[PDB]
């Protein structure tokens, strides 16, 4: 069987947290009053939800509305415990409210607004200091919820709501995350395809905050290469092959070796031998501008077969590539 793994941080976070911490299908939900919001504009449907723009009429601000399609309570009380536990946070997507949708028939959870450019448009404009600055500001995210006991399980440039006007930043869509317990077992049914972690992409379920990492290091391989996305697979195993063909065969070997991990037998005919490539090889004239020896050595840093190998968020705010973004 497959030899067990336990995060390197934050491990007992939650073991030594109240019952009543993470807990969720226990949770007793607080509900507002549904009458103080009114829709203005869809925003966006996806699998789980449509998302609106919104007016709270008892202080005439704007607000996102989120009208959850029906799904099992406990998935919906655990988005709402997680996001309630972490409020406050920093970049973390405040929850105003929560409202019971008279139309829908299910929760509604209201949102503070963020402004936000979408990322497709915003990303051809920002700098090598833009980007330095806004991954610094991911990770505060990231670090806060992982020391609070919570994965995200689902980063991506489409969470990532940024105000860039007023340089503001928040981590959306809690909908996929997680509390994190020693020896659990977890979905890997979890992130977007480009987004997916080598330990969902071999079946291993004892995973961990890591996997966030690796989501992160997706992003900024597409960010400084200016290639959206990075690792482009046509489905779950052809991604583990692009990533092969730039992490290399035999480190994936070593991965799977260490965990006592079989590769599916599907792969015995499209996974090839590659060696791993030197990041060098993706700079070029268009973005150059973007690379440094330290963006290439931190990306290395979060992409990493193995789990346990990956930079922690604190560890990443400490590497060299944040030397030069200002802080506060
Ligand atoms: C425009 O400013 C905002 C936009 C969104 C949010 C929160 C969302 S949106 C979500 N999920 C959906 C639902 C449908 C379509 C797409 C997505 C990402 N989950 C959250 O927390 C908060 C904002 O201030």
């Excluded at 947290?17 to 993470?22: F, S, V």
């Excluded at 995973?207 to 992160?216: F, G, I, V």
């Excluded at 092969?244 to 005919?269: C, H, M, Q, S």
Aim: overall charge neutral.
């Amino acid at each position: 069987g497959p030899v067990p793994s336990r995060a390197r941080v934050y491990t007992d976070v939650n073991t030594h947290r109240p019952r009543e911490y993470w807990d969720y299908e226990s949770h007793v939900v607080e509900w507002g009053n549904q009458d103080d919001y009114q829709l203005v504009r869809k925003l966006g449907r996806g699998k789980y939800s449509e998302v609106f723009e919104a007016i709270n009429i008892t202080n005439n601000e704007k607000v996102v509305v989120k009208i959850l399609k029906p799904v099992k309570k406990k998935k919906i009380k655990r988005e709402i415990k997680i996001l309630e536990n972490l409020r406050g946070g920093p970049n973390i997507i405040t929850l105003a409210d929560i409202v019971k949708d008279p139309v829908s028939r299910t929760p509604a959870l209201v949102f503070e607004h963020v402004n936000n450019t979408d990322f497709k448009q915003l990303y051809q404009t920002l700098t090598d200091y833009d980007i330095r600055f806004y991954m610094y500001e991911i990770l505060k995210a990231l670090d806060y919820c992982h020391s609070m006991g919570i994965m995200h399980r689902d980063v991506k440039p489409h969470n990532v709501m940024i105000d860039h006007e007023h340089r503001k930043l928040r981590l959306i869509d809690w909908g996929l995350a997680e509390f994190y317990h020693p020896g659990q077992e977890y979905n890997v049914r979890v992130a977007s395809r480009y987004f997916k972690g080598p330990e969902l992409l071999v079946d291993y379920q004892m995973y961990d905050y890591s996997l966030d990492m690796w989501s992160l290091g997706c992003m900024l391989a597409s960010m400084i290469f200016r290639k959206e996305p990075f690792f482009h697979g046509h489905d779950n195993y052809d991604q583990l092959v692009r990533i092969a063909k730039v992490l290399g065969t035999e480190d994936l070997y070593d991965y799977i070796d260490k965990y006592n991990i079989e590769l599916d037998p599907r792969f015995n005919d499209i996974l090839g031998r590659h060696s791993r490539k030197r990041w060098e090889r993706f700079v070029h004239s268009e973005n150059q501008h973007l690379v440094s020896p330290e963006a290439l050595d931190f990306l290395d840093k979060l992409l990493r077969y193995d789990h346990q190998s990956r930079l922690t968020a604190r560890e990443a705010m400490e590497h060299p590539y944040f030397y030069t973004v200002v802080k506060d």
